[PDB]
Amino acid sequence: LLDKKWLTFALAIYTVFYLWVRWYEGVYGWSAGLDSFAPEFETYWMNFLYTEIVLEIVTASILWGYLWKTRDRNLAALTPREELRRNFTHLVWLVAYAWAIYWGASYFTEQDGTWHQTIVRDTDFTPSHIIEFYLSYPIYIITGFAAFIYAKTRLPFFAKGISLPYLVLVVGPFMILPNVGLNEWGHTFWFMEELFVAPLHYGFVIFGWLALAVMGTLTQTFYSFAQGGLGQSLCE
């Protein structure tokens, strides 16, 4: 069996959900979403923010708790074939993390180079912010934490210790979410110019750099793949 169709679902769920989110923000961007003090803004974007925050907290708790509770206690008695299957599942988790990272840190982030550059902000909760920071960021954080936990709890290579590159790849992009405080503080106070390259953005950048730890993470996963079932063929 090895690599199964969980990868198709991993791609499709993010693609479909974010396409629907884009449709929603295209429909309610203007017209209930321009005026932050209008009653329709509360029903179409503040309610969205509340619901998405609650659902993200619940989903993160459930997913992480399930992954930690179903952790493999007897990692020693794991056959190489099962280890290969678990390595493929972890690679599917990493693919989902990469897809979510794309959607969060490229699409919905630059989608702002398109929302603010065009409108005069009305709040710290621009409908797009209700999409980027409170969805395009918690979703990829949840996916990254889940992938890290799966590696630690199913892969003997990633067990017996916390991998530094994986921890950086998982936590650095997470630090972008609390960095939103610097974004807000340095939008209203420091810098009223909509300059996208303002120093009030070296906060997603610095922690965007930590995603480069995917390189060490991926060579670690390559070594984990090539533990018992490394071949032969490769180097033979």
């Binding site: 203007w30 321009l34 932050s36 390559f222």
Partner: protein
């Protein structure tokens, strides 16, 4: 749509827009709508806002639903940033061409280099038609007419696709062979020196030479075509001509100003001294995009936005005609739902509880006087 969130005192004391007019309220695609009016730069410019040494006359709108055909300060076109003087009154004119159908809230705004957006009154303008009918023709000094909607789009797409294809070809050339794990094992276990061998080096040399040669040839071709080019035209424009307004014949001294918390009314006591030779009457109080009118004295006919217009929102304790030379003190109340809708009541949250505004005084013959008032605004709770 971006105001009602800015600080009330900052909206009150930055820039006062008046004599605003709109040529049309409903337009077709490609039809032109003109916005005219005057703005006065308040003398008590807040220290937190940089002085309007570099300012841009902008339009508040949800993306290019209109295109700014022309914009004027004084009588001269202002496509760049301009320098404004504190205390001066300027007249402006913005010409917009409809591009996208719908109902749009169009604001005239002034962006200041170190203070952010100063949004004036916004008016709903209806656009009907199809976006596909929109044209933005322009004639260059080289004698060709192009449509700015799609000019150079094909060339941009072609060049970007070409370079993307070159990069993808490079990556795929290296990706035909196995990529990650066997190459990693070969590099780790002993010297590799086997995964990069001729003609891989020849292919890379070809890629590098072709890239440089194609860049040079494309630049030369884009220089032979379009032989006449100019850099981007930028730079703040000085010498904006302000309006030479006559000195007002009305002097007003604000003796305290209060507003109820909570409430929708603002109360102030004014000592009005009438100079000149005509009986005056208080007709309007404009504070921040909100016009409180005394309907018995003046009526608005310029189609001011209804949510910003208080037809009878201005009540004067004694608004009888003020004979020349006579001085009297009256209690003026400006009350309207707009005071709470546009969050002018939220000056209680502000770190500077001072207001500014314009009082419009009208005589019998109809000629009007504009006087500016500013004072601390004291909340009242009991």
């Amino acid at each position: 749509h971006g105001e009602k969130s800015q600080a009330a005192f900052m909206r009150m004391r930055t820039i006062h827009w008046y004599d605003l007019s709109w040529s049309k309220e409903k337009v077709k695609i490609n039809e032109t709508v003109e916005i005219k009016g005057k703005f006065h730069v308040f003398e008590g410019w807040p220290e937190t806002v940089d002085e309007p040494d570099v300012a841009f006359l902008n339009v508040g709108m949800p993306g290019p639903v209109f295109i700014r055909k022309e914009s004027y300060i004084g009588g001269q076109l202002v496509p760049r940033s301009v320098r404004l003087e504190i205390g001066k009154t300027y007249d402006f004119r913005v010409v917009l061409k409809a591009r996208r159908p719908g109902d749009w809230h169009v604001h005239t705004m002034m962006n200041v280099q170190g203070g952010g957006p100063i949004i004036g009154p916004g008016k709903w303008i209806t656009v009907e038609g199809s976006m596909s009918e929109f044209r933005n023709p322009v004639t260059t000094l080289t004698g060709q007419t192009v449509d700015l909607e799609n000019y150079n789009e094909g060339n941009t797409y072609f060049w970007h696709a070409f370079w993307f294809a070159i990069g993808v070809a490079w990556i795929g050339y290296w990706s035909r062979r196995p990529i990650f794990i066997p190459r990693l094992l070969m590099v780790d276990a002993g010297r590799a020196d086997e995964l990069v061998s001729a003609t891989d080096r020849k292919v890379a040399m070809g890629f590098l030479a072709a890239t440089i040669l194609i860049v040079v040839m494309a630049m030369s071709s884009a220089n032979s075509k379009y032989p006449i080019t100019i850099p981007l035209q930028a730079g703040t424009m000085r010498g904006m001509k302000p309006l030479e307004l006559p000195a007002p014949t009305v002097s007003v001294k604000v003796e305290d100003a209060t507003y109820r918390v909570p409430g929708r009314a603002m109360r102030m006591k004014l000592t009005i001294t009438n100079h000149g030779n005509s009986p005056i009457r208080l007709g309007e109080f404009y504070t921040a995009s909100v016009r409180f009118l005394d309907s018995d004295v003046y009526k608005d006919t310029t189609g001011y936005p209804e949510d910003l217009l208080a037809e009878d929102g201005l009540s004067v304790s004694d608004n009888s005609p003020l004979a020349p030379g006579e001085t009297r003190t009256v209690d003026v109340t400006a009350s309207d739902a707009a005071w709470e809708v546009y969050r002018l009541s939220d000056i209680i949250y502000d770190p500077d509880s001072r207001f500014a505004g314009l009082l419009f005084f009208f005589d019998a013959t109809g000629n009007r006087q504009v006087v500016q008032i500013d004072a601390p605004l004291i909340p009242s709770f009991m």
